[PDB]
């Protein structure tokens, strides 16, 4: 049968809504989108050539176009280029420790591209922030959005910035003449979930 009046709505996954979004999140307040009930054609991504990083963990590109998953989650944010290496299982650094932490047993892909043309400004882009101070490291996929003043000394802060009392987020301040490692990179992390449940995300 061919029904046009009420068609089959299950089509290719809307990766464009994630990868080509105009607004991207700060890494401390990283964005998550749930992908479900669609066909995941990953070859639009695989052979795109526009990416600086395309690293897969526990899964292989070109094989992604096969097999099913329960759901896919897509996390997205901006970091500097020299921090992309921290978006990997088992890494350390300000980003992995205080902002976005992958689990050791991660199954998924980490994709990044240089966004200097969109995300830097002559006077500095102050919209993208990262967490610089935290009392302990994040657990995997933990997301800390606190703005509480960090007590860096023996004197209490009572909610006011001052000596040894720091606002915990700092701006990257991207400017277009930065060296490549200090330029902004947009990052998408695709995590593949497999439960004993109906699969809703399948390849073609």
């Amino acid at each position, epitope marked *: 049968e061919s029904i046009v009046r009420f068609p089959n709505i299950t089509n290719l996954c809307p990766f464009g809504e994630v990868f080509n979004a105009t*607004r991207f999140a700060s890494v401390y*307040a990283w964005n*998550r989108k*749930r992908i479900s009930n669609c066909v995941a054609d990953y070859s639009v991504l695989y052979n795109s050539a526009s990416f600086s990083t395309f690293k897969c963990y526990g899964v292989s590109p070109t094989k992604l176009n096969d097999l099913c998953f329960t759901n896919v*989650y897509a996390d997205s944010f901006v970091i500097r280029g020299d921090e992309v290496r921290q978006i990997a299982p088992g890494q350390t650094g300000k980003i992995a420790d205080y902002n976005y932490k992958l689990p050791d047993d991660f199954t998924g892909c980490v994709i990044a591209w240089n966004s200097n043309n969109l995300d830097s400004k002559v006077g500095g882009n102050y919209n993208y922030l990262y967490r610089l101070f935290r009392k302990s490291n994040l657990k995997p*996929f933990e*997301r800390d*959005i*606190s*703005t*509480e003043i960090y007590q860096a000394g023996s004197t209490p802060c009572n909610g006011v910035e001052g000596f040894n009392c720091y606002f915990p987020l700092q701006s990257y301040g991207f400017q277009p003449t930065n060296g490549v490692g200090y330029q902004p990179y947009r990052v998408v992390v695709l995590s593949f979930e497999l*439960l*004993h*449940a109906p699969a809703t995300v399948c390849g073609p």
Partner: antibody
Framework: EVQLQQSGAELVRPGASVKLSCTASGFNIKDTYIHWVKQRPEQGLEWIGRIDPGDGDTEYDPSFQGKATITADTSSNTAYLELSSLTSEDTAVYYCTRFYDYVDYGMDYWGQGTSVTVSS | DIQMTQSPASLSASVGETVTITCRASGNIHNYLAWYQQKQGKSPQLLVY???TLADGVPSRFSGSGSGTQYSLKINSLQPEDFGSYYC??????????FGGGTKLEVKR
């Protein structure tokens, strides 16, 4: 610390509208989703809906579509619940909470509640 | 959508006793389940998430278990601060993030 400070108790007549508020401190509401929950007297909790203050997007339980309108003011870090065409079934305590749907472990921070009483 | 029910509606137990309360989902929620405690006149507080993981600041005498559609909250060696109401809530798939009807735990004497 995180705090969700809700507006005070309301006593209103059937047919009226009321707008409740929740002012957050310790985080920016644009960085999460703000949810509202109803609890009728001696009754259970009911999820009303949520807003994403970063882009305005809302979702509601079908039973509250139209009755409830959730908005946010990021400049003052405040979320609002407007309830329209009030009836006695709307008498309840209303709570605001924070929950970033597919990330957070549960609804960790709640306001103190706002009592709404509808009566003639 | 998933509907949530709890049992018993009310239970009396003595300080020092152990109790088990139950949450049942209308369909399989794959451990995407939270428990809350609510004291009279206060807001709910998160106790357990992912069915079995205790939230920060919760005593280890609480334990969550279960699978599929049936979940349990066990309280070992009840203390006076434990009496109150308990609610479950699922986070499976998409909203609504529905709550169970609640269980009221009272003191037996």
């Amino acid at each position: 610390e995180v705090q969700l400070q809700q507006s005070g108790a309301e006593l209103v007549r059937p047919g009226a509208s009321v707008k409740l508020s929740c002012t957050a401190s310790g985080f920016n509401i644009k960085d999460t989703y703000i949810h509202w929950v109803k609890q009728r007297p001696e009754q259970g909790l009911e999820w009303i809906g949520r807003i994403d203050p970063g882009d305005g997007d809302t979702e509601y339980d079908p039973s509250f579509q139209g009755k409830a309108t959730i908005t946010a003011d990021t400049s003052s870090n405040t979320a609002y619940l407007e309830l329209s065409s009030l009836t006695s079934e709307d008498t309840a305590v209303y709570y605001c909470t924070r929950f970033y749907d597919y990330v957070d472990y549960g609804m960790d921070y709640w306001g103190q509640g706002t009592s709404v009483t509808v009566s003639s | 959508d998933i509907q949530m029910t709890q049992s018993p509606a009310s239970l009396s137990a003595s300080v020092g006793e152990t109790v088990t309360i139950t949450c049942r989902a209308s369909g399989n929620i794959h451990n995407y389940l939270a428990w809350y405690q609510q004291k009279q006149g206060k807001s709910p507080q998160l106790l357990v998430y992912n069915a079995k993981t205790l939230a920060d600041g919760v005593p280890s005498r609480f334990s969550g278990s279960g699978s599929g559609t049936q979940y349990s909250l066990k309280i070992n060696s009840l203390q006076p601060e434990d009496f109150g109401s308990y609610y479950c809530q699922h986070f499976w798939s998409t909203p609504p993030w529905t709550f169970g009807g609640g269980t009221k735990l009272e003191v037996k004497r």
